[PDB]
Fold:
Amino acid sequence: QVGRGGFAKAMRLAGFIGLAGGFLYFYQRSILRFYGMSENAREVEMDMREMTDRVKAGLPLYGESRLSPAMQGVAARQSRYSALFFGVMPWFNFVNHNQHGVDTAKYYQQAERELEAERLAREQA
Amino acid sequence: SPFNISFFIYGLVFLLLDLEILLLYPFAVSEYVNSAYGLAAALIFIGIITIGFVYELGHDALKVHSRQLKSSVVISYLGNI
Amino acid sequence: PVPFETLIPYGIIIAMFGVTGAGMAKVRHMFNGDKRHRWSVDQWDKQQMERDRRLTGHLRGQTDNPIAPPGFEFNNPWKVXXXXX
Amino acid sequence: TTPRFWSTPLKYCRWAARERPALFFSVVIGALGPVTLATVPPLRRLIGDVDAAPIPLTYPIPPGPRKQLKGYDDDTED
Amino acid sequence: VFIIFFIGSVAETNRAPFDLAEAESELVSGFMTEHAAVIFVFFFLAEYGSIVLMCILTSILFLGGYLLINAPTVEGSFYGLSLGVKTSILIFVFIWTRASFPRIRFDQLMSFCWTVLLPILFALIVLVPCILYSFNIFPVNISLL
Amino acid sequence: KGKFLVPGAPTGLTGLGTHPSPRSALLYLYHSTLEKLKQIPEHSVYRQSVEAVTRHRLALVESVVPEGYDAWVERAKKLLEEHADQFDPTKVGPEGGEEVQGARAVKVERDGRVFVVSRLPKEEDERVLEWDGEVDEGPELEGSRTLEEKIEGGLEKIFTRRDVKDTVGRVEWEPEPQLTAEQVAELENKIGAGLIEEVIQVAEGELKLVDTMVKARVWEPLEEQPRPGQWEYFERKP
Amino acid sequence: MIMISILSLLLSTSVTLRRDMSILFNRISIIALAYCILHDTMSLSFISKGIGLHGGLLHITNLTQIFHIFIFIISILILQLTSFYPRKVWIPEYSSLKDIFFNKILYYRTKIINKMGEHMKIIEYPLILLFVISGAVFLISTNDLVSIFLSIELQSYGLYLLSTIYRNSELSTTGGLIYFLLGGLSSCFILLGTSLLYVNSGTTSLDGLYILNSISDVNSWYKPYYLNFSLLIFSIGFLFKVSAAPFHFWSPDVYDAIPTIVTTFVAIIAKISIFIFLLELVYYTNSNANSYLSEFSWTYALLISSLLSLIIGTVVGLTQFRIKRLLAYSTISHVGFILLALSVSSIESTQAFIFYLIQYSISNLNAFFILITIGFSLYGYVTNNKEYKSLLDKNNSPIQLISQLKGYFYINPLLSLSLAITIFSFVGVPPLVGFFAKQMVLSAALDNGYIFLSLIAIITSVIGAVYYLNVIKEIFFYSPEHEVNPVLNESDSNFSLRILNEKNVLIRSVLLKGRNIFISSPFSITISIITNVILLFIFMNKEWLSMGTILVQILFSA
Amino acid sequence: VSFYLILIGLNFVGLSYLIVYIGAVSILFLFILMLINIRTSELQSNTSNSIPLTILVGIIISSFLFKMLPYGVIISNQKNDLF
Structure:
């Protein structure tokens, strides 16, 4: 029983609420696989691939940051597992830090291991 | 006699806005270490308090519009019965 | 024309600022031992002045000597207070 | 008589610039914060305006094992 | 910011065109007008004292303070004189506006503050640090200068 | 563009806005005046004077006809007969009804001629109107109430008020065509008594005057003779 | 998500003054809280005692996330009170799906549905409602002493605002003053307790306090008396906010004075957040070795308050004649049971604590929903009772006296049975869910040697049952004082309704009466689901009780 | 209190007290208090009736919280002195 233009105004706010809520749901579904809280075999594979390519290319595993190392620790300790709190407060990691919770030996073993495979193949030519 | 509520609003909005400015003064003397990351939180803090000021402005708790010839009757001639 | 009598109080106001500036610069300089004073003195600066006093006796005293005089190793002031810690 | 924003967005913008200049240009200046946060630092990289490294605010302890120096020992005194 | 700060300093000192406190022609205004003998001296001295201090602080913040455009006595005198010249100019402008404008009503002067000056300032509070970060000009906060 | 004057547009005289339907307002007032003067005797010069001025001005108002008037009148006359219950004051009241969000219209009879008075919701900004202008009579009486306070709260209005969207049995009243701005100027040039809005003001006052004159019976013998010497000043004997 | 909704709602609210937007804003708040449930349902796929978040100032547990969702669901249910008009018009000619979804109906609704009621004109009401929710969920997820203080003030200040938001009621402003003044004193004790922890321990982190407690529980120079004493002062402030005796005087006055729809939210949401917060703090500070620490344990304040609440809640309710004061005292007795379960720190009692809190929140919600629905139903009834005429704020609190319920079984028999089921669930009559809640608390208290408190719990339960029976007697044993309104059905007082299609073309025209004016579906359905959950719990108890069993196992997992 | 905090070196918080509490909170309190109708007679309680409870509360509360104050706050209040 609202007036002439009340419903359009309400729908505008509802549409923005749904877009914000819908986006956070989309982010949670992808980030839950990084957390290991959802089935992530495809994501495990491509991460193993993606990070190995960086090792042999020489680039840092997570990239380069304009933030001081101390401030990288602050960013890491703020957004770490933060998507589990998305029903109350949103947060996103936009920093390039080296605190991802994972022992990074696995990325170097593969890189070394398939650097020799390309070495033997190069020789046998 | 009754007193004017605008006096309470002026003091209320002053105090609440006085607190928020106070909370930004540490940032202005710490901008170098805060850099980009501290600036984000300051901008988040400013954005939140700006919305409450929009509420202040939109509802005009200071009575911005305190002080302020369409005719409802139109007549039609039809003639003799 | 120019109404100079109207401008006289401004000249007095301008001259009062100069008197304060000149006077404060002179008395501070005599207090510092005939040298220009310090400003924006932080904790490092204050500590360096105390170390200067335990070499010369004066908080603004300077010495280029590479070897400290005897008793320097004994005159580092530990400050004592009764309440505020 | 006043235009409505959601039906005619551009007409409202011109009216607000002319009829509520203080409110309109506060929103414009406020939105320039994010705009320069997105434009200039990419611009500065392209032209070669590099960011200065942070100045030391603590003693810069050298990374690695100690160098095992041999010099200025006690026998060197006097 | 300098223009807004100067306007705010005039209002902060109950000076015209923001001078309802001493206005006798306005029917309800003129609170300062009932102050006799010593009490008038207290209030008046405090007001002129604040006018001079708001002009000094304005020069400090925006006009370079004591800065200009070997002996300690003359260096000090020039610094004092430069601060005085800048302060005196703002005192002149301060007098200049009282003589030039009519008086704003209380409801209008409160609306000027809360719907014009503050919304611009809070917008500038967003923009300025973004410019500082974007140009790598966030200053150091240690004891320097 | 400037073909028709804008109702409410300032005329130049402060507080005197442009009239919404000025030609019919004059006809209504003039005819209401002649009918109200029928209760005065024929030997009253007051009645003879008002008649002469009004019937002369009435003739001039009729001399200016809005474009397409004949086309409008046939349908408007046709509309009254088929929906008389919608416009009769004895049923909907002299204001046309209690619904302000909707359009009201009442047929009225003066001097042998029929007029329809119409009322429309005021054009207000949609950002500020609540429930499309429906009158707020507070909230309903909830809880444990006596019958008496229920009737004092207009509970019977539930059985007689109409939703604004509910237009099944009723019809939309169409307005008379308006005189153009050119037609208004040439008509008031004919009357020669100022702007059309001022002429309407004079007609409203003249309509108000008849009731005072009838109640005072100003046409009968002198009420009180001047006693001797009442009006004698210091005039020298000629 | 709750924070985006608050900011987004405020911006939309800031630029409007239209009070007809209030019902729409309430509905968007329901939609917004539904997304909050979705994001927290997504977050339960991990097993942990706790994950500190956001620099260690917050934390997340399986327990924390379960009770975020519960707080959201209770708030959606309560928000219906301001999102749908209390009454509707129903007819058999507009009941098909093709009708509700393709056709429209038209009638003069304003007086019938109370379109302009006070509880439908407060623009900012759903927004202050969400502010309280934010304080409640932040308090659950709080990991730090400063975070504790900020969240409790955030929830508390919103509740004061809600008690006063009906600014034209003399009762509501009076109740708002009382809650703020006594609530502000309570907040000093919380700040004093938190501050005494910091000044002695040197940390604001709950993690660090637990570590300090754990090492000091051995079996000299810095004996840690501060921890129990500070938490004792800290706990007293939280006992006020749950209205536990002897800190309960404010609530019968505040609950009665503020409007009933406001009372529904104010009397439910705050206990859930404080009790859940207290549960973790009880666990990690609970000494194991019988040392000098355990003898000064702050949790005796909880056991004393449970005892005092069991007596005050049941004895003082005996003479209440106003229905809202009785519910306030009925609540005090139920927090007595809740506090007993929190005090016994056993696996059994923690399962009992978790189940009791949820089922009482659902049950107390039903009682308020039934009480508001009975108030909205009396519109078509009149009475000549001289007492009812002299009531204040009749529009805000239509039912104020138990005597107003006299013969309600003859006005609406099935709605009266729903009230009776809920009240019988409060006493603990099997096989209602209320019985099973009291049964679990008593078995856990008995198994831990709490014999004396278990005996007082049973004795006070019989006393409490007296005023519960007293409400039921008024509804069923007497004929009503309310008569149907004559002018609503007088053989000629019929209002009109039009049925129109998708193209706004007429289909039919029906003349209607007061007997075609019914309770709105949201309120009847919510009462019907909850009433059947209370009644049929014995067939549906497996998942509900297994959830708490698993939650306690995670908390206790050595 | 603000002057005390300034003199021990807590200059920022001490000045914050002056700006915030005196500068704005107290100004708001006096505005409302100096606009409302107050009869001082309606506000006077018989304080002598509250004096025995005043003594009992003071001894009870002080004896409990003082034991909780850490050494930093009690080392220099109430021959051999510690520097």
Summary: The radius of gyration of chain E is 19 Å. Helices of chain E lie at 2-12, 37-62, 72-100, 106-134. The CA atoms of residues 22 and 33 of chain E lie 6 Å apart.
